[PDB]
Amino acid sequence: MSYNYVVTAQKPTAVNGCVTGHFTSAEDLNLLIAKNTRLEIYVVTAEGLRPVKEVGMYGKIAVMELFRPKGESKDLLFILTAKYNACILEYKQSGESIDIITRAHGNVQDRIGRPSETGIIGIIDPECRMIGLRLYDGLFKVIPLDRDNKELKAFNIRLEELHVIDVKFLYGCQAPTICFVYQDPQGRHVKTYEVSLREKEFNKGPWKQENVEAEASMVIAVPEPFGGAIIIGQESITYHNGDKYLAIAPPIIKQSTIVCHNRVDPNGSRYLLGDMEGRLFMLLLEKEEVTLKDLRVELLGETSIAECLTYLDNGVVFVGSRLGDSQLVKLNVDSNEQGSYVVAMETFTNLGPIVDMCVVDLERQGQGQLVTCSGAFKEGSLRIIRNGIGIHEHASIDLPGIKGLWPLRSDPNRETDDTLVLSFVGQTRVLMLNGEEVEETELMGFVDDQQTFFCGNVAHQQLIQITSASVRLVSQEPKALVSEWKEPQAKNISVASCNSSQVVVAVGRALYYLQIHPQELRQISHTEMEHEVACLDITPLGDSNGLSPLCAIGLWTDISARILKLPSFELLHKEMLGGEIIPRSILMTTFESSHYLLCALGDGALFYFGLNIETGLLSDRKKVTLGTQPTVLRTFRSLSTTNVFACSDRPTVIYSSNHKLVFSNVNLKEVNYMCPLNSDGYPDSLALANNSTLTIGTIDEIQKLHIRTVPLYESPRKICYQEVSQCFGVLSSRIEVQGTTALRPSASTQALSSSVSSSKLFSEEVEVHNLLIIDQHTFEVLHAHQFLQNEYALSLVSCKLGKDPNTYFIVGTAMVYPEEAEPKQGRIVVFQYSDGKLQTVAEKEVKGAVYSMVEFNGKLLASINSTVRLYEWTTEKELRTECNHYNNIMALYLKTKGDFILVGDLMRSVLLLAYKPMEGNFEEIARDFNPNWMSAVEILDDDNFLGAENAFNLFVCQKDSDEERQHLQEVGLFHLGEFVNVFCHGSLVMPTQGSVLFGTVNGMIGLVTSLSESWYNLLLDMQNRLNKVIKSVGKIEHSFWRSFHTERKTEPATGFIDGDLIESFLDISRPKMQEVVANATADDLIKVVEELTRIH
Amino acid sequence: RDRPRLPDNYTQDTWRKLHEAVRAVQSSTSIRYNLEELYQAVENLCSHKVSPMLYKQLRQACEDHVQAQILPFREDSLDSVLFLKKINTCWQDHCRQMIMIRSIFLFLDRTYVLQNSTLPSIWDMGLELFRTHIISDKMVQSKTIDGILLLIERERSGEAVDRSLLRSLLGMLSDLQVYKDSFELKFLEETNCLYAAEGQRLM
Structure with missing residues (x-):
C-alpha cells in the first residue's frame, strides 16, 4: 500500500461561476463566487468587494444559484456538485459567529444516464416552485420546493428531446414553463414545456417549437414586462414571446461566440453578453407601450475572457474568468476616446489553466520557485510563485x-x-x-x-x-x-x-x-x-x-x-x-x-x-x-x-x-x-x-x-529552464485570422530578435506557434522563433545530449491540417540559444505528432503518435533512432527515473517501460490494465507511479511485489476534484519523503508527498475523527467526496490523506480537538499538524 | 540636508594595516587589536571593488611568507625522525595562521569568496602555497614519502613509531592529493614486496 499526503499549496483561482443576491442579509448585496471547490462570499460595498466568508465545499460546484422561497427573509443558495450533491444553503450570522446551515441536501446522481453533452444545467423557477436540473440526456430532473423537503427528493420527467443545448424557466407564466434549445437532425429548435409537479410530467408549452439559428446555444429568460426568451446564436439574436419574433444579426457579434450573459436590470431592458474573445456587449430591449420593440447590440469594450459575469451596481461589473484574471470593471456612460466604456477597477489573480510549470531555484537560493504557463489565448502569461515576506x-x-x-x-x-x-x-x-x-x-x-x-x-x-x-x-x-x-x-x-x-x-x-x-x-x-x-x-x-x-x-x-x-x-x-x-x-x-x-x-x-x-x-x-x-x-x-x-x-x-x-x-x-x-x-x-x-x-x-505576472498576450503551452543560458524556453501559440494577421501584439511579436523556421522537410483563423526565449531575471522575450506554417509545437525539453557539452532547446512539433484527425507529419527541431540568437542545430522529420520528449540518460526519448522511440545524439549532431516501442494507443506523457520510463497513455493509462542498455531495446515491465484517461503522470519512487485521470482523480500505481507480475497494482485512489495538467518534483520551501507539485486547470497548486506507514495510520485515524467532528457545508461526506469516481467505476479513497482536512485540525476550538483526540494528548497532534503544514 | 563625507583616509591607511596584520598573524607576531578591530576594519574598509585587489594584496603578502618558509626545507638532511617533525610543525604553524587570518578575513569570505565562487579559498590558496613551495615540487616530497615508508615499515616489523606523526603526515598527504595521486603507489608496492617476503618466509 502507498501512503501519500495531498494538500493544497494554492487554492483554485479560476471562477467557474458567480451569482449576485441578498444572501448574507436582506439589505446586503452579495457576490457569491464559485471557484472550483471554494465558495467565496463578498458584500458589494460602494467600492470593491469586502470578503465575509470563504467556505470549502466537498465538491466541484457545478451549479450555484440564489433563490428566495415565499416568506423567506433572504436568499437561499442552491449548490449542485459535480458528483451531484445537491444542497440548499442559508447564511446565518450570530454576532461574530458565521455559519452556513444546510436547509436541505441530497444526492441526485442517477445510477445510469448519459451525462448531457453541454454539461450540468441547473435552473430555478422564477417563483421558486422547483429546481430543474438537466444532468443526463433525455431526462429532466425536478426538485420540488413547495413540498418543503430536507432530503431533496427529485423526480425525472422524460424529455422527448435528447440533445438539449440550454434551458431556462420563463417568466410571467402561471405554470413552471421551461424554454430550451435542442438539436435534432432537422436543425436546432426552441421548444417550451409546462411542468406539472402534480402530474409529474410535461405539458404543451405556451408557444410551439420554432426553428432557430443553427448555432443557437443560449436562452435568456426575460422578466415579466416582456416575458418570452432571447436565444443567442453565432450570427443572430432572436426574441420569442409566442407571437412576437424579433430577430437581429448584429455584424459585430459574428467574430466570436457569446458564452455568458447577465441581466443588468430587474426588468431585463439591458443584458451583458461576454464572448470568448473577451469583448463585452450590451443587449438593449427597447420597450413600447408593454411589448418589445427592437433589439440592439452595442460593444462596450473588452474585458478578461469571461466565463461568468455579474452586474453588481453603479456600473460595477464582476467579470469572472476561468482563463485569465477575474475582473471588477466599471461601465462608463461615455466612451474612453478608444471606443470602450469598460474600465478595469480591480484584478483578482488567477493562475489560469496551468498547462505546464517548472521549479527553478532562481536567485540561487535554497528555495524553489514555480514558473507556470498560466492562462490562455489573450490572457496567457507566465506566473512566478514563491513563498516569502513582502514589503x-x-x-x-x-x-x-x-x-x-x-x-x-x-x-x-x-x-x-x-x-x-x-x-x-x-x-x-x-x-x-x-x-x-x-x-x-x-x-x-x-x-x-x-x-x-x-x-x-x-x-x-x-x-x-x-x-x-x-x-x-x-x-x-x-x-x-x-x-x-x-x-x-x-x-x-x-x-x-x-x-x-x-x-x-x-x-x-x-x-x-x-x-x-x-x-x-x-x-x-x-x-x-x-x-x-x-x-x-x-x-x-x-x-x-x-x-x-x-x-x-x-x-x-x-x-x-x-x-x-x-x-x-x-x-x-x-x-x-x-x-x-x-x-x-x-x-x-x-x-x-x-x-x-x-x-x-x-x-x-x-x-x-x-x-x-x-x-x-x-x-x-x-x-x-x-x-x-x-x-x-x-x-x-x-x-x-x-x-x-x-x-x-x-x-x-x-x-x-x-x-x-x-x-x-x-x-x-x-x-x-x-x-x-x-x-x-x-x-x-x-x-x-x-x-x-x-x-x-x-x-x-x-x-x-x-x-508575479508576465503578460504574454498569447497562449503559453510549455516551459523549460536552461540554466547555462539564463533563460526560459516557452512554447507559445497565437491566433491569426486572415496571408495572416495578428489580432493583437503578442509577446512573440514583441521580442528583441526573431526568426522563422525555414525547413526543407515539408513542402478563418490559424494558430501560429513560436519558441520564446525569456530572460530569467527580467522575464523579457529575448527571442521568438516562429515555427513552420501549420506547425504545432507540442513538446519542449531543455537538455544536453550524447557527449557534446551544448545545452539544447529541443522542440517536438506536428503538422496540423484540417483534412485529418491525427497529424501524420512532424519533426524534432534542436535549437541552441547562444549570443542572443536561436540557431537550428538539427532537425528530424518524424511521421507523427511528438506529444512528449524527455531527456533519458544522455538520449532523447520522444513519443511520436503511438510509438515511443529513443533517439541518440550522434557526433555529427543529428538524432539517430536506437529503439522503438509500439504497444500504445497514444503515448501522451513520458517520465523518467534511471533506466525506467513511465508512459501515460490517452486511455490505457500507464506503462512501466525499461531501457535495458545491455541489449539496446525497451521492455514492457508492468502495465495498468484499467482504462484511465490520463491527464498527467509522475514517478514518486522506484516503484510508485502517480497518475491523474481526466475524471479529476489521482491514483498511485505500484509494480506488484509470473505473467501477472506485468500488472501494475493501483494501490492509491483519490478524487482530487481538479484536472491535473502537470506534475513536477520540487518544493517551495527550504516526516514526509519527496515532494511533487502539480498544477491544475482551475489554478490549484497541490503537493503530493510520501508518508511512512505509522504516520499514515495515525493521520487516517484523525481523518476519520475529523469527519466525525467537522461538519461540511452541504452535509457531504468526506469519504464520498474523496472516493475515486469514474463514469464506469467508483471506489473509496485509499492510500491518500486529504492534507486539507488534516490541516483543518488547527482551525477548531480545544473542546472539538478533545472530541477528535479521545483514544495521545492533543498537543502532540497539534505539533504533528504544524510539522505537516511545514511542507508548503 | 546631510553634506557628504570624505572617504580618503579610509582607503589609504588600509593597505598598510592589511600587510601588517598579515605580518602580525604570520610568524605569530603580536597584535594590538585583539583581531576584532581588524575584523571590523576588514568589514568597513572593504566594499564593492575593494576586495579583489585586496585579495591580491593579502595573497602576495602571505605568498611571500610561504616562500620564506621554503629555505629551511630545501635541505640535505635525511632524518624522517626529525625532518618530518619540522614539516609537521610548519604544517601546524601554517594551519593556525591560515585559520586565524580567516578569523580576520571571514568578511572576505562571506562577501566575495564564500559568496562568489571565483577564487581558491583562503584554505585553498594557503594549501596551494604550502604544497607548491614546501611539499610538492621538492626533494621533500620524495624524501617524506621515503621516510614515511621507513616509519610505517619500521612500524610493520614490531615497534610503534609515532601514531600522531603518521596520522598527521597522512593527513597532509591526502589533503594535498599526495596520498591519492601517485604516492599511494610507493606505499602499496613496498607493501607488496615486503608482505610477499613475509608470507613466503613464514609459510
Missing part, C-alpha cells in the same frame, strides 16, 4: 555603504523614534525623517567625526551613542553630553552591546561593564578573557525589574558562543561550535515561550537554544544554514511578538508559529542592516539598508504565496 519600498535614499541604523526619538515627549542614525566609515550622519520627508539634520550630542557601533534611546529620558572611541550618554531635552566614559588606555572599542538601561562593551580581549545613571555613566565589572571578543548581547527580555541578568559571548580561536552571568562576567557555560570562522553576530530573544539564543557563524549556520534565566546553560543545540554571507540579527516587535530578522544575501525573517520556529524568506535582493522604526508617518515599519541605498517598508508577515 513596500516607500522611503528610499541612496547613501552608499551604510554600516548602521538605529531608531531615535528626537522629540523627547513622543515614544515614536522620529530620527534615524547611520555610521558609514568614521562618522555619524543622522536623518530627521520628518513625516515622510527625509533629509539629514543634526541633533546635538552626537559626533560627526567617529564611527558609531551603536546608538539609541535609553532610560532616564536619555540617548546613548557608542562610537569607535568612547561612549556618549546625551541628556535628550536639555543639552549635549553630561556623561562620558572612555577606555583608560583609550583603545578603540572593538565590540559593543547595549540596552535601554546598561551597557557592555568589549575592549580587545577584556570586557567592561557600565550601567547608566541619570546624567552619569558608572562602571562596575571587568574581566580578562582568553581571546578577543567576537559578539555580544545583553538585551533585557521579560525583564520586569529594569536590567538584564545575562550576557553571551563569542571568542576567537576557541569558537564558542559562551554564556556569562552579568554582575560577575563569570563563565556560566562554554559551548564550542567548530570551524575556523569567528561568529559575527549573537542575539538572545524570546519566541512566545522563553529566552532563546541565536548565534551564527560567518557562513549562515545558525544555532537556536533554550536559555534558562537561572542557569543560562546552553542545551538543545540544533543548527540551521541560512545564506553564505556573514550575518547579523536585529529584532522588530510586531503586533504579536518579537520577530527577528537576519540580514545577508538571503534576508530571512525569523519567528515561531504554534511554538515551532519558522525561517521565512524575504523577497528582497540584499539587506546589509535593519532597524525597526515606527514614525508618525511610518507605523511599525522596517528600515533595510543595502550597499547602495536605504530601503524602507513594512511587512504583512502573513507568509502568503507571492505571484
Whole structure:
C-alpha cells in the first residue's frame, strides 16, 4: 500500500461561476463566487468587494444559484456538485459567529444516464416552485420546493428531446414553463414545456417549437414586462414571446461566440453578453407601450475572457474568468476616446489553466520557485510563485555603504523614534525623517567625526551613542553630553552591546561593564578573557525589574558562543561550535515561550537554544544554514511578538508559529542592516539598508504565496529552464485570422530578435506557434522563433545530449491540417540559444505528432503518435533512432527515473517501460490494465507511479511485489476534484519523503508527498475523527467526496490523506480537538499538524 | 540636508594595516587589536571593488611568507625522525595562521569568496602555497614519502613509531592529493614486496 499526503499549496483561482443576491442579509448585496471547490462570499460595498466568508465545499460546484422561497427573509443558495450533491444553503450570522446551515441536501446522481453533452444545467423557477436540473440526456430532473423537503427528493420527467443545448424557466407564466434549445437532425429548435409537479410530467408549452439559428446555444429568460426568451446564436439574436419574433444579426457579434450573459436590470431592458474573445456587449430591449420593440447590440469594450459575469451596481461589473484574471470593471456612460466604456477597477489573480510549470531555484537560493504557463489565448502569461515576506519600498535614499541604523526619538515627549542614525566609515550622519520627508539634520550630542557601533534611546529620558572611541550618554531635552566614559588606555572599542538601561562593551580581549545613571555613566565589572571578543548581547527580555541578568559571548580561536552571568562576567557555560570562522553576530530573544539564543557563524549556520534565566546553560543545540554571507540579527516587535530578522544575501525573517520556529524568506535582493522604526508617518515599519541605498517598508508577515505576472498576450503551452543560458524556453501559440494577421501584439511579436523556421522537410483563423526565449531575471522575450506554417509545437525539453557539452532547446512539433484527425507529419527541431540568437542545430522529420520528449540518460526519448522511440545524439549532431516501442494507443506523457520510463497513455493509462542498455531495446515491465484517461503522470519512487485521470482523480500505481507480475497494482485512489495538467518534483520551501507539485486547470497548486506507514495510520485515524467532528457545508461526506469516481467505476479513497482536512485540525476550538483526540494528548497532534503544514 | 563625507583616509591607511596584520598573524607576531578591530576594519574598509585587489594584496603578502618558509626545507638532511617533525610543525604553524587570518578575513569570505565562487579559498590558496613551495615540487616530497615508508615499515616489523606523526603526515598527504595521486603507489608496492617476503618466509 502507498501512503501519500495531498494538500493544497494554492487554492483554485479560476471562477467557474458567480451569482449576485441578498444572501448574507436582506439589505446586503452579495457576490457569491464559485471557484472550483471554494465558495467565496463578498458584500458589494460602494467600492470593491469586502470578503465575509470563504467556505470549502466537498465538491466541484457545478451549479450555484440564489433563490428566495415565499416568506423567506433572504436568499437561499442552491449548490449542485459535480458528483451531484445537491444542497440548499442559508447564511446565518450570530454576532461574530458565521455559519452556513444546510436547509436541505441530497444526492441526485442517477445510477445510469448519459451525462448531457453541454454539461450540468441547473435552473430555478422564477417563483421558486422547483429546481430543474438537466444532468443526463433525455431526462429532466425536478426538485420540488413547495413540498418543503430536507432530503431533496427529485423526480425525472422524460424529455422527448435528447440533445438539449440550454434551458431556462420563463417568466410571467402561471405554470413552471421551461424554454430550451435542442438539436435534432432537422436543425436546432426552441421548444417550451409546462411542468406539472402534480402530474409529474410535461405539458404543451405556451408557444410551439420554432426553428432557430443553427448555432443557437443560449436562452435568456426575460422578466415579466416582456416575458418570452432571447436565444443567442453565432450570427443572430432572436426574441420569442409566442407571437412576437424579433430577430437581429448584429455584424459585430459574428467574430466570436457569446458564452455568458447577465441581466443588468430587474426588468431585463439591458443584458451583458461576454464572448470568448473577451469583448463585452450590451443587449438593449427597447420597450413600447408593454411589448418589445427592437433589439440592439452595442460593444462596450473588452474585458478578461469571461466565463461568468455579474452586474453588481453603479456600473460595477464582476467579470469572472476561468482563463485569465477575474475582473471588477466599471461601465462608463461615455466612451474612453478608444471606443470602450469598460474600465478595469480591480484584478483578482488567477493562475489560469496551468498547462505546464517548472521549479527553478532562481536567485540561487535554497528555495524553489514555480514558473507556470498560466492562462490562455489573450490572457496567457507566465506566473512566478514563491513563498516569502513582502514589503513596500516607500522611503528610499541612496547613501552608499551604510554600516548602521538605529531608531531615535528626537522629540523627547513622543515614544515614536522620529530620527534615524547611520555610521558609514568614521562618522555619524543622522536623518530627521520628518513625516515622510527625509533629509539629514543634526541633533546635538552626537559626533560627526567617529564611527558609531551603536546608538539609541535609553532610560532616564536619555540617548546613548557608542562610537569607535568612547561612549556618549546625551541628556535628550536639555543639552549635549553630561556623561562620558572612555577606555583608560583609550583603545578603540572593538565590540559593543547595549540596552535601554546598561551597557557592555568589549575592549580587545577584556570586557567592561557600565550601567547608566541619570546624567552619569558608572562602571562596575571587568574581566580578562582568553581571546578577543567576537559578539555580544545583553538585551533585557521579560525583564520586569529594569536590567538584564545575562550576557553571551563569542571568542576567537576557541569558537564558542559562551554564556556569562552579568554582575560577575563569570563563565556560566562554554559551548564550542567548530570551524575556523569567528561568529559575527549573537542575539538572545524570546519566541512566545522563553529566552532563546541565536548565534551564527560567518557562513549562515545558525544555532537556536533554550536559555534558562537561572542557569543560562546552553542545551538543545540544533543548527540551521541560512545564506553564505556573514550575518547579523536585529529584532522588530510586531503586533504579536518579537520577530527577528537576519540580514545577508538571503534576508530571512525569523519567528515561531504554534511554538515551532519558522525561517521565512524575504523577497528582497540584499539587506546589509535593519532597524525597526515606527514614525508618525511610518507605523511599525522596517528600515533595510543595502550597499547602495536605504530601503524602507513594512511587512504583512502573513507568509502568503507571492505571484508575479508576465503578460504574454498569447497562449503559453510549455516551459523549460536552461540554466547555462539564463533563460526560459516557452512554447507559445497565437491566433491569426486572415496571408495572416495578428489580432493583437503578442509577446512573440514583441521580442528583441526573431526568426522563422525555414525547413526543407515539408513542402478563418490559424494558430501560429513560436519558441520564446525569456530572460530569467527580467522575464523579457529575448527571442521568438516562429515555427513552420501549420506547425504545432507540442513538446519542449531543455537538455544536453550524447557527449557534446551544448545545452539544447529541443522542440517536438506536428503538422496540423484540417483534412485529418491525427497529424501524420512532424519533426524534432534542436535549437541552441547562444549570443542572443536561436540557431537550428538539427532537425528530424518524424511521421507523427511528438506529444512528449524527455531527456533519458544522455538520449532523447520522444513519443511520436503511438510509438515511443529513443533517439541518440550522434557526433555529427543529428538524432539517430536506437529503439522503438509500439504497444500504445497514444503515448501522451513520458517520465523518467534511471533506466525506467513511465508512459501515460490517452486511455490505457500507464506503462512501466525499461531501457535495458545491455541489449539496446525497451521492455514492457508492468502495465495498468484499467482504462484511465490520463491527464498527467509522475514517478514518486522506484516503484510508485502517480497518475491523474481526466475524471479529476489521482491514483498511485505500484509494480506488484509470473505473467501477472506485468500488472501494475493501483494501490492509491483519490478524487482530487481538479484536472491535473502537470506534475513536477520540487518544493517551495527550504516526516514526509519527496515532494511533487502539480498544477491544475482551475489554478490549484497541490503537493503530493510520501508518508511512512505509522504516520499514515495515525493521520487516517484523525481523518476519520475529523469527519466525525467537522461538519461540511452541504452535509457531504468526506469519504464520498474523496472516493475515486469514474463514469464506469467508483471506489473509496485509499492510500491518500486529504492534507486539507488534516490541516483543518488547527482551525477548531480545544473542546472539538478533545472530541477528535479521545483514544495521545492533543498537543502532540497539534505539533504533528504544524510539522505537516511545514511542507508548503 | 546631510553634506557628504570624505572617504580618503579610509582607503589609504588600509593597505598598510592589511600587510601588517598579515605580518602580525604570520610568524605569530603580536597584535594590538585583539583581531576584532581588524575584523571590523576588514568589514568597513572593504566594499564593492575593494576586495579583489585586496585579495591580491593579502595573497602576495602571505605568498611571500610561504616562500620564506621554503629555505629551511630545501635541505640535505635525511632524518624522517626529525625532518618530518619540522614539516609537521610548519604544517601546524601554517594551519593556525591560515585559520586565524580567516578569523580576520571571514568578511572576505562571506562577501566575495564564500559568496562568489571565483577564487581558491583562503584554505585553498594557503594549501596551494604550502604544497607548491614546501611539499610538492621538492626533494621533500620524495624524501617524506621515503621516510614515511621507513616509519610505517619500521612500524610493520614490531615497534610503534609515532601514531600522531603518521596520522598527521597522512593527513597532509591526502589533503594535498599526495596520498591519492601517485604516492599511494610507493606505499602499496613496498607493501607488496615486503608482505610477499613475509608470507613466503613464514609459510
